[PDB]
mmCIF file of C-alpha atoms in Angstrom:
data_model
loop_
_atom_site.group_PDB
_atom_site.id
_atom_site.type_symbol
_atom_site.label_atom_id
_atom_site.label_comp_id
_atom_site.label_asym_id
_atom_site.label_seq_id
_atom_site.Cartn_x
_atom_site.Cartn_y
_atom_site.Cartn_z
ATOM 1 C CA UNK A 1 29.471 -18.875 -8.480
ATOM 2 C CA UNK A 2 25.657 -19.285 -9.727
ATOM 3 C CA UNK A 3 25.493 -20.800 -6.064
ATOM 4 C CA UNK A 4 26.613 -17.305 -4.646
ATOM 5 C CA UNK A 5 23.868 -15.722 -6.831
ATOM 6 C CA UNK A 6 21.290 -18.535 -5.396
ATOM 7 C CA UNK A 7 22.105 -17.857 -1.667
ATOM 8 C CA UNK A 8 22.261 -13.916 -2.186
ATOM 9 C CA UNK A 9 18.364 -15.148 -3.794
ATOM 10 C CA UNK A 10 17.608 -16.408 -0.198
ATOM 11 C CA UNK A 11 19.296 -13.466 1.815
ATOM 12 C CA UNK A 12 17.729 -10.800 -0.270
ATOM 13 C CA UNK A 13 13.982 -12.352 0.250
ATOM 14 C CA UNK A 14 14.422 -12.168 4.355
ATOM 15 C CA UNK A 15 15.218 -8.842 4.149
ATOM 16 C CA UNK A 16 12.398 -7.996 2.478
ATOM 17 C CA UNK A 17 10.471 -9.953 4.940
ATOM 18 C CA UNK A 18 11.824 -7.613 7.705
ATOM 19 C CA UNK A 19 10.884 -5.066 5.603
ATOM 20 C CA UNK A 20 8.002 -6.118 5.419
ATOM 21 C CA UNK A 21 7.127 -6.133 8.888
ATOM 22 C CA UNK A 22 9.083 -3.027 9.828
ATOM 23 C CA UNK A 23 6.487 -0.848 7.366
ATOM 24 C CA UNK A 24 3.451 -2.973 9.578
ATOM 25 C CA UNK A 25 4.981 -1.452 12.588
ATOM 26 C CA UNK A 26 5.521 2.172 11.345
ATOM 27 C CA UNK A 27 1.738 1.821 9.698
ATOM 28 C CA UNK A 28 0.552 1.017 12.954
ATOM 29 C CA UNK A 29 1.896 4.125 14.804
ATOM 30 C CA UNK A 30 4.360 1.823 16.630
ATOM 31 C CA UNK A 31 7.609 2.384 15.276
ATOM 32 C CA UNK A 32 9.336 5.034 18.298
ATOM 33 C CA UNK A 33 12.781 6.695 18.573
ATOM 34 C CA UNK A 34 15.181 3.982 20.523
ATOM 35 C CA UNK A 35 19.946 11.469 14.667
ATOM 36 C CA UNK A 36 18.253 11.346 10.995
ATOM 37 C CA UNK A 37 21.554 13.360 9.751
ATOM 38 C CA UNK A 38 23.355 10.685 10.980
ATOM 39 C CA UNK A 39 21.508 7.929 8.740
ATOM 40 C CA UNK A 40 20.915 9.810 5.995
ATOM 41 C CA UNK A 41 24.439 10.308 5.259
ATOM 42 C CA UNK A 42 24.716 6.168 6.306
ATOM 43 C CA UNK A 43 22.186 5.682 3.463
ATOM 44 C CA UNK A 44 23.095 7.722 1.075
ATOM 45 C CA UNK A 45 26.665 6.169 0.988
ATOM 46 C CA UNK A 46 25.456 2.630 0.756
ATOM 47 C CA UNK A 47 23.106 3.664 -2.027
ATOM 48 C CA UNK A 48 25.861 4.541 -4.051
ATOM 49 C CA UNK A 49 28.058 1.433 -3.557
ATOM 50 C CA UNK A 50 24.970 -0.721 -4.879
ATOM 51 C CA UNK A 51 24.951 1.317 -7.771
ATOM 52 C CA UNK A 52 28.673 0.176 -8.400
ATOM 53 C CA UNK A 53 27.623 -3.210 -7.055
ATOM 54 C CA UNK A 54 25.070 -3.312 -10.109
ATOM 55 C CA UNK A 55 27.588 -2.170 -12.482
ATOM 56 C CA UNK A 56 29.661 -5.026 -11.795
ATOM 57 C CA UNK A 57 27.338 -7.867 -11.459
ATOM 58 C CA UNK A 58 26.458 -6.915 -14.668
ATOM 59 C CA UNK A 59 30.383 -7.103 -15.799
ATOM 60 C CA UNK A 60 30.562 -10.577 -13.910
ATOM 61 C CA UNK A 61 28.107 -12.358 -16.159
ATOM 62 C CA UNK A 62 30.717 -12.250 -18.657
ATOM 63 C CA UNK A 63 33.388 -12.939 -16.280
ATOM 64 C CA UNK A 64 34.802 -15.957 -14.057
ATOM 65 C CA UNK A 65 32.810 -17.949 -11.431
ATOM 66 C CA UNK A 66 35.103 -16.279 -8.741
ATOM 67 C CA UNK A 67 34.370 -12.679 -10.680
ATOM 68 C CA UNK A 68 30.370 -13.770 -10.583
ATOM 69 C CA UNK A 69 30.507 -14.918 -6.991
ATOM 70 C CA UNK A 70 32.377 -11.778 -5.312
ATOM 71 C CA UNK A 71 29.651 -9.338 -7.141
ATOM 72 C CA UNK A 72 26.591 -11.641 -5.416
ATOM 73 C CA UNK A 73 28.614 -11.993 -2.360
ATOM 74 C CA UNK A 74 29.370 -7.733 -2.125
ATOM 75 C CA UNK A 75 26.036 -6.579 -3.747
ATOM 76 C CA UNK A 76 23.944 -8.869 -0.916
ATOM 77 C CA UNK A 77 26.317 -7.431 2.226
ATOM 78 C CA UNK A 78 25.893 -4.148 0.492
ATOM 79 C CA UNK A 79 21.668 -3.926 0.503
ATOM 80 C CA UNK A 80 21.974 -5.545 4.502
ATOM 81 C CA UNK A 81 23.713 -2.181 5.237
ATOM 82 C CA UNK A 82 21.848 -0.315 3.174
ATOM 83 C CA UNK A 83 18.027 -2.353 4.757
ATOM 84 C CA UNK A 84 19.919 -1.612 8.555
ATOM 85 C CA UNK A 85 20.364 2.217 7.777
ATOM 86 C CA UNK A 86 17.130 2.537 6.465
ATOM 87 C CA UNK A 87 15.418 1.335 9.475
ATOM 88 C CA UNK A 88 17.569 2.983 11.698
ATOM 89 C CA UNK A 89 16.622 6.300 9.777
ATOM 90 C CA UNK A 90 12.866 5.814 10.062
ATOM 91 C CA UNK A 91 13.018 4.571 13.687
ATOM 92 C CA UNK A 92 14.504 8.160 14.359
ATOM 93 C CA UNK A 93 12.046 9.805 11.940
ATOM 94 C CA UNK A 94 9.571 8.670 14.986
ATOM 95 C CA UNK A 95 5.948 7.470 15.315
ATOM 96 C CA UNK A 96 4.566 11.272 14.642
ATOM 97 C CA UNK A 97 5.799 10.813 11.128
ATOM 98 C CA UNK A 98 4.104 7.335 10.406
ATOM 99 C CA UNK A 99 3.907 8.634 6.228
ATOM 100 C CA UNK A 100 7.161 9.102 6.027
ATOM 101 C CA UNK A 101 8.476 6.211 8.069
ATOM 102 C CA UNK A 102 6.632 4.027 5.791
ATOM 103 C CA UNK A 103 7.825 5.340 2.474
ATOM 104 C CA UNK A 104 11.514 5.460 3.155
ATOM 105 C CA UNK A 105 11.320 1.894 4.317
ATOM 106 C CA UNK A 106 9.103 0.844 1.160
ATOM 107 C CA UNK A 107 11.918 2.807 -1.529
ATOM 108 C CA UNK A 108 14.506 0.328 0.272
ATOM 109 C CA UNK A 109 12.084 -2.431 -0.171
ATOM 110 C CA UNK A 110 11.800 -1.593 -3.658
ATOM 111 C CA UNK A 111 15.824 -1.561 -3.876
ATOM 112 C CA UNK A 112 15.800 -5.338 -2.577
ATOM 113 C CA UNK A 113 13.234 -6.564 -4.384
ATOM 114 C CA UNK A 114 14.557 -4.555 -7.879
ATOM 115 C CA UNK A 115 18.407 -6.147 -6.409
ATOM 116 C CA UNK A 116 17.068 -9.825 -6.209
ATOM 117 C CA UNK A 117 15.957 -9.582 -10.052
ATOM 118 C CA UNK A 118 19.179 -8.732 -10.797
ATOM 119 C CA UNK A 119 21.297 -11.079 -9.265
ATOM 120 C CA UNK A 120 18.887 -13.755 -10.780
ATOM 121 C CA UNK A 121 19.115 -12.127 -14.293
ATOM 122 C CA UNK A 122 23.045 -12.450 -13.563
ATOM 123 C CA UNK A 123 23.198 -15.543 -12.490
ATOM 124 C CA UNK A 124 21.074 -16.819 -15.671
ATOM 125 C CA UNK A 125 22.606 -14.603 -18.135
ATOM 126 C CA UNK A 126 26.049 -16.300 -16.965
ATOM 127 C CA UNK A 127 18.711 -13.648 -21.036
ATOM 128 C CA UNK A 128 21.133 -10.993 -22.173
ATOM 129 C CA UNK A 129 17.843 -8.881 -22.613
ATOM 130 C CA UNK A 130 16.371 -9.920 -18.891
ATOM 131 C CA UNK A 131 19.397 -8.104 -17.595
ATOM 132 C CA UNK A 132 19.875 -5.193 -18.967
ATOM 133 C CA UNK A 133 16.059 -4.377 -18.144
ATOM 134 C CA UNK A 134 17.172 -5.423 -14.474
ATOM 135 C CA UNK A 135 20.187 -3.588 -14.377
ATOM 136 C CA UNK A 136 17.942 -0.356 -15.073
ATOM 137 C CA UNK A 137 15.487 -1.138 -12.890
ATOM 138 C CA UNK A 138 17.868 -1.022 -10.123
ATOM 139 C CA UNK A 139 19.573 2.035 -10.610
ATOM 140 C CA UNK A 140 16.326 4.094 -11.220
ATOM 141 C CA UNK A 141 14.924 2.507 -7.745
ATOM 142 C CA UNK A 142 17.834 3.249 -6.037
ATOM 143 C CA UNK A 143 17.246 6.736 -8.038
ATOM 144 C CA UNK A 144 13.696 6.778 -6.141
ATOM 145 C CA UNK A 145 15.098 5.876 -2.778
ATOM 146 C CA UNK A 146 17.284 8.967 -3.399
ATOM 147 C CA UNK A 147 14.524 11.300 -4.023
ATOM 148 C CA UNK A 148 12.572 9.921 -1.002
ATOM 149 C CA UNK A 149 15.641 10.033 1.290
ATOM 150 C CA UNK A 150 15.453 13.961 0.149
ATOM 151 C CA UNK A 151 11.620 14.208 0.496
ATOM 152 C CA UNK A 152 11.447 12.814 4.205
ATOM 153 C CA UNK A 153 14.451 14.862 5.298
ATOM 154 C CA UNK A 154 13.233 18.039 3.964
ATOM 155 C CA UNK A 155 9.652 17.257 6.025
ATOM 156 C CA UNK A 156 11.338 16.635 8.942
ATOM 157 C CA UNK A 157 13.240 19.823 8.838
ATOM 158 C CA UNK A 158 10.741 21.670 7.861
ATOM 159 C CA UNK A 159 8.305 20.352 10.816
ATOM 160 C CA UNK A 160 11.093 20.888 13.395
ATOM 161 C CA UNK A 161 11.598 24.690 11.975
ATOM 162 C CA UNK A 162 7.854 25.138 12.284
ATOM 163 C CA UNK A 163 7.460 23.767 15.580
ATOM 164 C CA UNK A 164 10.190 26.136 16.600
ATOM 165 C CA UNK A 165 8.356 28.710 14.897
ATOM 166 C CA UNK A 166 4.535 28.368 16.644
ATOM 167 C CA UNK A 167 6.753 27.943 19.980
ATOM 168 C CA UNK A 168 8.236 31.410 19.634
ATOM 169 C CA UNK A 169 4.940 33.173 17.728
ATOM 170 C CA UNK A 170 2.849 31.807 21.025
ATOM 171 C CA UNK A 171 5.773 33.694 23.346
ATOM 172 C CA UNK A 172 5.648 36.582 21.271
ATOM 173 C CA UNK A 173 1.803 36.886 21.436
ATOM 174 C CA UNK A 174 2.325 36.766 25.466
ATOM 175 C CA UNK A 175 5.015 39.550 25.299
ATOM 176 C CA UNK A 176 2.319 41.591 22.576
ATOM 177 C CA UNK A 177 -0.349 40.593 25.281
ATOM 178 C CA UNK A 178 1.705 42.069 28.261
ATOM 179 C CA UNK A 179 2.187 45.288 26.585
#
């Protein structure tokens, strides 16, 4: 009940930990390939189920101790998707795009740490003012993973299109060049 909210507490702070160390990899240069379509769409979806996830923690601190432990319980295996996705999608990203690598990963960071607050404010408001702050912190980080999710996929496109681009340029300077 509040125990569910106190173990989601402990969950919730190792993530971040692997977080953590996931952005010293990428700062590093050392975070390779092992597509970002793929995750993107992965993230994306999980995104939006924490946003639901928020809306009903915030429903279970007026309702039952089963009610209150089901929200910690979902909201907790719904930010380990979202923390696996996100390094999945920087991993593929690749060590050329170290900038981008890093802020994706940091936006979900910010999601787990803003998601921790939250089920504390919960489990303490089962105060009233601590969590409704929370409960809009989350959903405007979430909001800002969003926007970097869109920032670091339009990048990468636009890198690949340009790479495409010098490729064929260089060619068409040999063909200009052979004439």
């Amino acid at each position: 009940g509040t125990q569910a909210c106190i173990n989601a507490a402990h969950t919730v702070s190792g993530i971040i930990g692997d977080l953590d160390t996931t952005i010293m990899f990428a700062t590093a240069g050392t975070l390779h390939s092992d597509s970002f379509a793929d995750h993107r769409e992965h993230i994306l979806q999980t995104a939006k189920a924490l946003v639901e996830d928020t809306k009903v923690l915030v429903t279970g601190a007026a309702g039952t101790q089963d009610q209150l432990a089901n929200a910690a319980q979902n909201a907790v295996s719904t930010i380990t998707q979202l923390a696996e996705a996100v390094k999945r999608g920087a991993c593929s990203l690749g060590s050329t795009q170290p900038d981008s690598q890093v802020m994706v990963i940091n936006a979900v960071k910010d999601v787990a740490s803003a998601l921790g607050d939250l089920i504390n404010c919960t489990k303490l408001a089962s105060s009233m003012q601590d969590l409704k702050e929370s409960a809009r912190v989350m959903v405007l980080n979430v909001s800002s993973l969003l926007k970097t999710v869109k920032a670091v996929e339009d990048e990468h496109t636009r890198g690949t299109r340009a790479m495409e681009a010098t490729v064929e340029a260089i060619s068409q300077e040999i063909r200009a060049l052979e004439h």
